[PDB]
Homo-oligomer: A and B are copies of this chain.
Amino acid sequence: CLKNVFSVLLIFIYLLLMAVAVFLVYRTITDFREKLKHPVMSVSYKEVDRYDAPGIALYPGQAQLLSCKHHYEVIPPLTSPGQPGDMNCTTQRINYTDPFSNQTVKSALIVQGPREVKKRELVFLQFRLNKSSEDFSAIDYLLFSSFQEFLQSPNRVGFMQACESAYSSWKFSGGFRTWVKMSLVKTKEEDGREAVEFRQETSVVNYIDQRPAAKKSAQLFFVVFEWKDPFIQKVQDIVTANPWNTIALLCGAFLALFKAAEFAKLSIKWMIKIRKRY
């Protein structure tokens, strides 16, 4: 009457293997949910021959700018303060309404930044704020990726608001030269898009005002816009769980368990033979 016992015994292999099968599909499902929740990042650096001329959206307001001078040389030659002119920018002043507020027009000024990173070209601006009641001399600016696109785009009055919302506006101080070493990051969201963001590393250098040494003491600002490295750090969140390399593995495990059940039927046959031997 204990033959059905041996039957359920040989079937215990089926039972345990179906149990580990449902356990494994559960674990694989929950791990796929996890790896689908938050993907994995991946950085790659693509060295570029020469950058596309960025757009420096300075917001001087009242402070008139003195000079512009690109300098392929690693060092900007000796300047002469308080003297306007010497401008050699492809500058363009453009107005728009702050998308944050729409309550105050923020006059701007656009500059074609440096292009030749290997030649180490660098825009060197100069500004002046003849004494006012600001109490903190600061001219904030902004960087978008390619200046020619701004020149050619239609209704750039709105393209500028799009930039101001996309990028971030960090100010350069007043009273010392701020060597801004720009650098790009072409980050790619997974929804088939490419987002260009500027990450810069300022380095302020104090201005020795002993050269003018006068009674005017008018505030004057200095900037240097440079390309940090000839590379473009582009980061894209890689989806580490595709719907294919997981179902194939689940099928492989299901087949492993099926083959194991077949080997278990073979082992039950061997055990029946051994019992017949006894």
A interface residues with partner B (beta carbon < 8 Å): 24, 27-28, 31, 35, 38-44, 74, 78-79, 81, 100, 120, 131, 133-138, 168, 170-171, 173-177, 179, 201-208, 210-211, 217, 219, 222, 228-229, 236-238, 240, 242, 244-246, 248-256, 258-259
A176, closest chain B residue (CB): B206
Are B137 and A206 interface neighbours, CB within 8 A? yes
Contact A100 B79 (CB under 8 A): no
Taking A205-B173, A211-B135, A249-B249 as contacts, is the C-beta distance between A244 and B40 under 8 angstroms?
Answer: no
Determine the distance from Cα of A270 to Cα of B248 in the docked complex, in whole angstroms.
Answer: 27
Contacting residues, chain B, for A79 (C-beta < 8 A): 135
Known: A136-B222, A137-B206, A174-B208; 19 extra A-B contacts, CB below 8 A, are A27-B244, A38-B44, A38-B238, A39-B44, A40-B40, A41-B41, A100-B120, A134-B208, A136-B206, A136-B207, A136-B208, A173-B176, A175-B206, A248-B252, A248-B253, A249-B252, A251-B252, A251-B256, A258-B259
Whether B254 contacts A256 by the Cβ 8 Å rule is yes
State in angstroms the CA–CA spacing of A79 and B134 once bound together: 9
Q: Report the Cα distance A204→B136, complex, angstroms.
A: 10
* Least Cβ–Cβ distance between A23 and chain B, in angstroms: 10
With A137-B205, A205-B174, A258-B259 in contact, do A240 and B238 touch (Cβ < 8 Å)?
yes
B171 and A205 within 8 A (CB): yes
Q: Which residue of B lies closest to A118 (CB)?
A: B100
State in angstroms the CA–CA spacing of A176 and B43 once bound together: 36
